[PDB]
Subunit: 385 residues, 4 copies
């Protein structure tokens, strides 16, 4: 189960470089030079890295220091063959963003947020990124009167519409992906799930430029089924990027390594991504636990990729098993794929077998055979077939 | 705080008529004749009632018995002045629906589901309903292999598109509202939140015919902020109907009377509905607890309306208080309503006050004054000003 | 992975015999004769069965009918070799129990609850049960004023103290196990977790007669770590019985087959039960999904046992792996088992290496190596070592 | 609703002094001198303050600097009349504690934890504290193999038993209170709820020295009913201290001001504390939101006390209302307080009215009248009677 760059595994600089500071404790690890993270991830078989503007260029840098930080980074990329497929803005750390960026109540902050974002879109295009992620971690409220949500959504649409005008006017080949999260660090965050983000995109001026960047742990913080939400994003044609990690239920955002947390959900997720032919990056947004030293950091990151590749093998064996294909027919998954009424509305209304003569008791007696199918899936996951 | 029909309070027949059967216990109350429910609710000041087909006409009724049940119902409506603004289909109780209606794996069940729905649309139009609700309570799964969600969404779109063709071809003045719910009775239900439903509607053939029917308790079963989701539905122009009740956190669907459960959320909800000028029914989908006899049933229903009217008074006093209007300005809610960049993209790029000369430390030091505002809201809710 | 009675797998009659009635739907399967359930479970390799009084003897049976139902049951046990290790009372289904049994507000109901329980203790002893389970599913409230919890706990202690006096006076060799659950069917249930039950037992007159019967899904309905709670029950010497099943997070009580739901938690649970030498029954309190026919029922029950035996094999391989034993030492699990201060309090106070000369920065720099250990556990679970 | 020191309102130094650093953002407020916090809280009508050792004496202080920090603090207390009723240890911030203090896997860390705690017990007694709180925020795990929970509980008992030996040998008049929390910052924390803590105390060598310090938000992070857990702690005689704040459901620990979050739960909590005659401090463990400047900090703290006093008035009016006292009898709260079987076990067995002649259908038909009672409670809370 050894990864190669063909597998398109990517990591955020902020993931392996997380120093371990949490709401109740100081950092437990020293800071990582971005150049060393690139080389260590290349050694592990990763395909590329991603960054916030403030991960790469420390906040408040002159254009000279900025130039030097980028040149060092590009030289590490050229030395290793690593790519940069995605980039994003930090609109959450600095105190100025304490009430949001695009939806801050203060107008001057909203304008500064847009200028800070545009500057990093230029940098992302230069380094070759195809997707620009927006996570509005501070867009939200702790109390009901602080934020008129209809006005906030107006301001959110205005900001994204302006970004789309910018990339259109410059001729950039880059697309945006909105990353939802239901809460933390705000009490409630705007666009809290995949569904709310998908709905919001359809109200933008150029909806075709925008998709979603769902994260495993974020939908599970609302107790939702992550493979189900990913299917809906694929069904709408909007899965532009994905963030893989692990989460143990409804609580603070844990960002465990992929495969930890809900293991069966990770299996069904890989099954879906591989059978639907998702061809984007397999990006890990995780945090090595602050119990770990740097040896633990790299073991945790290697484990992300290993677990994807074991699950990929097991799901492929599951779908190729003739006994499984036979069980899928026994449960009528084949009938689910067939149109309900390709004969049209009038034919349906005139069909007495659809109502007047339908034997409801005979249909109700047919078992679905779902438990035998699920135990075959369990046996395959566990390598017990 | 006495209700009048001008307040447009409505109840489902299945609410006051719930016999108290739950997953672990037998019924504690006898069944109610729909005609008696109509008269008792009219006496309490309700505006109207709603029904599932199987609430009004017992499943498996001949057209003769069906005719007699409807005539008795209409005579009770004419006797009392009660209206019927909404109707819906029961696609969840009969065993035939154990794997869903519109997205059942069995094709013949999906066809029967559509025929059963269309028959009740005709009845709803006859009784004057303006909204037809669809709650897909059995559309979902307990295990991952049982349901290909992309195929299921294809089948869901096909069913709703067919219903829209039917009402268009008949010339009916009726609109559809999709009611989301994240789980129960299935392990996960398709279109689990307001956001997923809003996103799905935009993929239908005639999106203008469809909106949402959110329920307080359902969004709170995912730990989401219900007033926030309602603002997004209003922002999209899709709040066609609403179900009011109470829920104590993330657990089974409690359907407590409105005002119980999360009291502060109910205050912010009423504040939003009244300030946005929602003019549809205030519908209660609740269950009087099975501890109660029929006297408790009617006290519980009266309490639904009372609590709405107390909250309406307190939110109106809150917004009219000059000290509150002054605090809203202190927190810059007025600036949130103003465009970020009505001067356009180029002017923003050239504005040095938006970036090169923006004083980030001075802006960051400005407090938002949100806690004083929220304590004014608390004082108003509690009648302590 | 074939079960034998040596594995001590047991099932409730109400589990495989669940007819599929849920809060929103009618039954999907016919009722099972208890005698047929016994024979079909014996065929699958189960060790025994358990029952509520009302599962075996239908409520309101004369002593003659009661005698005949028991004789038929005993003949099925003698025919198959199946044992009855546990029994319990139904104090939740009949309407009389709508406000509880032992803590109902009505005194006459509380007295009836105790008489109904005592009658079934006699029957349990006759059939050879060693443990008598009490699940107070109706002890609780939906509203705050309905139940003074201090008075309710007084009444709960009085009821259990009376049961202990009864079994002591009769000379029965039977012990009680309290089964906690946080909610459903009441809004909040008294003694909602393992911890609350363990605390309550220590206030009884004869605490040595009482232990806990934890259920996987119930602690997970509060988002708690089930293996952690089981360790605390074992640490106190109170794990008298256990209910195995599966649950997908914080929501209604799903009662999935064991191994579904949180798979990694099931692995750590089996690891704990086997390494601590738990010798009681492995009891399954699950519900075959109502999508299933009777063939699905038996496949679901067989899957319960299969999944325990696969997990038992993987956890045993994990603990026997020298590379794992070496990693456990690397993470200092051996030091966790050694006393902090066997040298006593005075020696600790005088030990300058414990404070005045303790190198806090050197200790803080030591990584815990927990991620490498957990990936070894993952590899073992998945059969990838 | 103006507070006076007679109301015994206390605040942690770390509450109003929280600088606003969270997992995703830098501090938004400058640090507060503890002496200024004391004077500003005295001005607001608080009774006293509490502290962690590291709040008052910065970590790594020489005995000279330590002496000066304490003298400045004592002079502020003498100047204002403020008391110090409780103190606690910081065993969570420094990196050395990344795997716990009392249950760290490393033995030398566990010894250092005990020495650090004992030093602050001496200081607490000097300043007059009656209660010493222990919150084991780092005692726990993110993965299953990292922590044998039975060994960890052995180590936890050993540490607390040693602290009890220390205070006994010194003749201190101080008691310990264990503060539970289910998760954050560890993935799962040991002793996660009030119940688990109460159970653990009964296994200590001197159980009478130990009680619980429950926090509103912590039990609500497990979706539990906080007034119910407080009743159980009072019933066991173990409510030594209490932490008041607000929390909006199952998510990260919000620490909102008291009265925000679940408002009805706060009403029932105050009703319980006042009717049971709790005489300890009303301590607020809250965080002013990082949106606020220092004016917002003090408004948030004043709001804590105001909201307690409004709720105290409303609950007292509720219990004194004759119409409520009559409704309590209608719901048989009086019968709940009467013994089930003061006539003893034999009399119960011989009582034919308790079983053979009990009219189960007549009892089942009696409504509990709980909804009318709860609407009276709602009317009183809202000031609408
Ligand atoms: Mg995350
Ligand atoms: Mg992410
Ligand atoms: Mg509901
Ligand atoms: Mg509803
Ligand atoms: Mg259960
Ligand atoms: Mg059970
Ligand atoms: Mg807290
Ligand atoms: Mg606290």
């Amino acid at each position: 189960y050894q990864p190669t760059p063909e597998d398109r595994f990517t990591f955020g600089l902020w993931t392996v470089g997380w120093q371990g500071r949490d709401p109740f404790g100081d950092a437990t690890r020293r800071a990582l030079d971005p150049v060393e993270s690139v080389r260590r991830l290349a050694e592990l078989g990763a395909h590329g890295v991603t960054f916030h503007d403030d991960d790469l260029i420390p906040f408040g840098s002159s254009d000279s220091e900025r130039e030097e930080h980028v040149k060092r980074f590009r030289q590490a990329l050229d030395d290793t063959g690593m790519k940069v497929p995605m980039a994003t803005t930090n609109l959450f750390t600095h105190p100025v963003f304490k009430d949001g960026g695009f939806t801050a109540n203060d107008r001057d902050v909203r304008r500064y947020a847009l200028r800070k974002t545009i500057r990093n879109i230029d940098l992302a295009v230069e380094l070759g990124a195809e997707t620009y992620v927006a996570w509005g971690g501070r867009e939200g409220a702790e109390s009901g009167g602080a934020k008129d949500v209809r006005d906030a959504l107006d301001r959110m649409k205005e900001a994204f519409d302006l970004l789309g005008e910018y990339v259109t006017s410059q001729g950039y080949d880059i697309r945006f992906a909105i990353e939802p999260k239901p809460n933390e660090p705000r009490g409630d965050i705007l666009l809290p799930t995949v569904g709310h983000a998908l709905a919001f995109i359809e109200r933008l001026e150029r909806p075709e430029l925008y998709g979603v960047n769902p994260e495993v742990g974020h939908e599970q913080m609302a107790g939702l089924n992550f493979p189900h939400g990913i299917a809906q994003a694929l069904w709408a044609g909007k899965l532009f990027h994905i963030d893989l990690n692990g989460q143990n239920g409804i609580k603070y955002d844990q960002d465990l390594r992929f495969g930890a947390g809900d293991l069966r959900a990770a299996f069904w997720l890989v099954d879906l991504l591989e059978s639907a032919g998702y061809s984007g990056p397999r990006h890990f947004d995780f945090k090595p636990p602050r119990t770990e030293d740097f040896d633990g950091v790299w073991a945790s990151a290697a484990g992300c990729m290993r677990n994807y590749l074991i699950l990929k093998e097991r799901a492929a064996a599951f779908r190729a098993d003739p006994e499984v294909q036979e069980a899928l027919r026994a449960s009528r998954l084949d009938e689910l794929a067939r149109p309900t009424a390709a004969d049209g509305l009038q034919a349906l209304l005139d069909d007495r077998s659809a109502f007047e003569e339908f034997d409801v008791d005979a249909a109700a007696a047919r078992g679905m055979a779902f438990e035998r199918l699920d135990q075959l899936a369990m046996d395959h996951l566990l390598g017990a077939r």
